[PDB]
Nucleic acid binder design. Structure first.
Lengths: 84, 94, 97, 106, 99, 81, 106, 93
DNA sequence: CTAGGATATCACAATCCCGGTGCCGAGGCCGCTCAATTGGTCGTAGACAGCTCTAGCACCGCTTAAACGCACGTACGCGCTGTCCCCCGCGTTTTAACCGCCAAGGGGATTACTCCCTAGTCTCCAGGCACGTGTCAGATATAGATTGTGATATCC
DNA sequence: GGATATCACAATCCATATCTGACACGTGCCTGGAGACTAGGGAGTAATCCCCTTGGCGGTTAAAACGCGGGGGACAGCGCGTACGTGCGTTTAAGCGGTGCTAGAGCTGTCTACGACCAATTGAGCGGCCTCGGCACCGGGATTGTGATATCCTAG
């Protein structure tokens, strides 16, 4: 399977602009975006790992949505609207 | 064939009881089902922990009532307690 | 010719995107990011087409909450521009690093 | 053969909740009054959430409850907002609000 | 002219003196009376064990110190050194205690 | 200086707590807000402690009840059971 | 009679932990290796915490571990600070940390 | 009545780690409470893991996954290594 | 000369190190008792083969909407000053926390009997899930109306 | 000069087709839940002993609160410069569909190993107490850190 690299830059600046606009931010500095691309890259690294831990435990090779929901619930961030 | 179960029909019954002319979407229905499962699991866990704390081996209505009073705060606790006590009394009166 | 003074388009965007419920990050870039992040832990994984959507929703909600707290921190400092120090202070107060 | 859900007047299932309680490994043995009480509380909570969601949906001139309506109803009520303190609702958006300082001065 | 320390150095000295001890900072009797009047509103004539009040005192002291750390961070964020009620309100609203 | 018992948390006590926290200068309006915050926290903890106690048909609030009430809020307390 | 702790080479009990697991309403049946493995992890964590606490106590020229020593040991290690993220230690004090702004400018 | 705490075992661990260092009563109570809290954390996570996969048992695999989920980073690897060592030594008499 | 400023120098007070005791909490020895172990059986659940089949994956044609690169200007964040006013630091004295003993006396832990209810199992039959299928309210697109913002005109 | 006022333009909301994916409803069907019977065990009751929490008194005595003088810092003000938003123009992945493919997901069948149960035995550990050493108080003496002060330098 192919190897992926340098994809955190795929979260474009307009995406962060829209995300902040939803959060209610009027004016944005120029150094936010890079910082944001770090913060996001931490959150996933703290969730996906748990999902992987929840997947390889069941001797599976597929990260279903239920594993992600359980990983999120294991962080006080329960997500409603995905399976059970 | 699988027979995965959910509270879909009961939630729909409640919605038609409180809003006869209003429907509900599928994603919203899944959200409500997940919320019901989460609240049920949370209340059951708190009640089981309470039963374990007193060394009592049975979950009675008292444990569930105290679990509801602990988890649901404010005015929801009073309304839920009244509803549960009324339902229990009705069942015991057949 | 015709030009909007700075801020008015920002207010229009704020009133528009808060009303909408769609996703604000594109699907393929987020999927590739998730795959390259998961490649570090276990090799040759296969995400369901709904697990990536769940991760996208969770990440978007977390980022929106973080930006709400960052905006609060920026307004506290008598400013309207959010700065990296604001994000750092918000994450320090919430208790995560 | 009348189901236990009919005797208590609750729309939610009593037998299903009893079986889930007994097979969820909460206690070695479970009384019969717990399932009915829990069903009543679940029914009341679902009724409250659906009532608020329907009111929100009517406020937006729609005849169908959507996740956006549920999020609006939940976050526009302090009691349920505290009950949903750490809960994310998928495809629900956020409350429309703009801070006072960001608004134009004049 | 009697010796008089500059305004601020005594504050730093007592900061260093109080971050080194583990004593209880709130007096025991006033805290016990506060706990008793607060508990009186939920069940009349409750009896408190001699350790429950101590546990409450330890928890409340830890909570208040943890809140004051974030209040200090917020005050420093705004290019100040004094903490004001808006700092406490912001610190509590970021971490999630609505009031 | 009684006014019930909330001024039992004396102003030097709040100053000591702030000094331990790491505060150099304190405004004059901090004390009232701190008293209110402490009162709210104590109300929230004691309500759960009293609920735990009255569930067990007891009239004495045990230290374990306060420990459980703190554990329920994500404020685990080590040293009392 | 050789206890299971002696065979496993652990200081923490295996029989008591197995009994607590089985009488704690966690699962219907509990394997023989789970108790041993859990005892091993508990012993490792206790050894780490006590080693760091002893180092802290020796740093203060004392021959007895107090709650202050345990607080200093836990809050001065990233892994244990993450494990103790929301845990209060009674009579443990706080880490000495004065912010840079408060420091004398000259 | 008996209390059945972990005082003796924590004392043994401390004595084998630091031979000449003692521990106070308050610190011993704190360590006992810490051991209990970690035990219920791991056991609850293992129970939820076993119930997710419709399993009705808690095998060392479940406790290993719970340890990998709770303990942060470097603690998890050492803990799993020592637990595997203990299990291997036990199964070898 | 005259004024106003850094820079090196001295006396005061809090801190920290070194012991001299009192003692109080921790380390060590015994009783016994309550829980862990060992030996066999059983029935249960986990593990191995396997076999469909089903969903994730890889690739592409393309329509285009979102994004990237630039010009420009204006509005906010940063920076420097004055200030007054709010908190700090100190001195004194009235006050409330506090350690010590006591007598209730209200509550809590334990034990014997019990009886009420919850567990185990079988039948069956009716409710809840899968599967289609018909009806419609929401998404999309125009078209007109209303509004909020900005460029322009007059006055104070 | 700018402060107020007044009209024109872009954005948005609303009313009407309209189009269709999405939801509410009627049939299989199948499985789980309710009734009946038997068994046991778990918690309610009643009494009892004693445990330990509260009210009271009392002399300390250290905290605290009231005021008073001073200083430094938060705030209001101004100046600027720079960087960030707004619009234009062009490129470039994205979304969607369409296809085919391959690994892995799920369920059934069978094998086996393994954990619960049950009983007797025995030793590991908890409460009790007894003794000892590390700690905290306390007093003294270096050891600095600091606020005030003499000393030197530069513009007007």
């Amino acid at each position: 399977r192919k190897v992926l690299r340098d994809n955190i830059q795929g979260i474009t600046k307009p995406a962060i602009r829209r995300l902040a606009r939803r959060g209610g931010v009027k004016r944005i500095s120029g150094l936010i975006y890079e910082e944001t691309r770090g913060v996001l890259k931490v959150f996933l690294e703290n969730v996906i790992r748990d999902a992987v831990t929840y997947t390889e435990h069941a001797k599976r090779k597929t990260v279903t949505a239920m594993d992600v929901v359980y990983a999120l619930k294991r962080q006080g961030r329960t997500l409603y609207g995905f399976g059970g | 064939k699988s027979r995965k179960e959910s509270y879909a029909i009961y939630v729909y019954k409640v919605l038609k009881q409180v809003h006869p002319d209003t429907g509900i979407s599928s994603k919203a229905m899944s959200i409500m089902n997940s919320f019901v499962n989460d609240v049920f699991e949370r209340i059951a866990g708190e009640a089981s922990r309470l039963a374990h704390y007193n060394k009592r081996s049975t979950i009675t209505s008292r444990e569930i009532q105290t679990a509801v009073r602990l988890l649901l705060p404010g005015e929801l606790a009073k309304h839920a307690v009244s509803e549960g006590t009324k339902a229990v009394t009705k069942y015991t009166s057949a | 010719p015709h030009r909007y003074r700075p801020g008015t388009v920002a207010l229009r965007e704020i009133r528009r995107y808060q009303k909408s419920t769609e996703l604000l990050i594109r699907k393929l870039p987020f999927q590739r990011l998730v795959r390259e992040i998961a490649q570090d832990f276990k090799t040759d994984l296969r995400f369901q087409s709904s697990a990536v959507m769940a991760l996208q929703e969770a990440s978007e909600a977390y980022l929106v909450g973080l930006f709400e707290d960052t905006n609060l921190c920026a307004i506290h400092a008598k400013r309207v521009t959010i700065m990296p120090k604001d994000i750092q202070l918000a994450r320090r107060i919430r208790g995560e690093r | 053969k009348a189901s236990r859900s009919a005797k208590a007047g609750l729309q939610f299932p009593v037998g299903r909740i009893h079986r889930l309680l007994r097979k969820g490994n909460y206690a070695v043995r479970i009384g019969s009054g717990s399932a009915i009480y829990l069903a009543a509380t679940l029914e009341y909570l679902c009724a409250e959430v659906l009532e608020l969601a329907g009111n929100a949906a009517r406020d937006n001139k729609k005849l169908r409850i959507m996740p956006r309506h549920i999020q609006l109803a939940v976050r526009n009520d302090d009691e349920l907002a505290k009950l949903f303190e750490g809960v994310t609702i998928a495809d629900g958006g956020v409350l429309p609000n703009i801070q006072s300082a960001l608004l134009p001065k004049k």
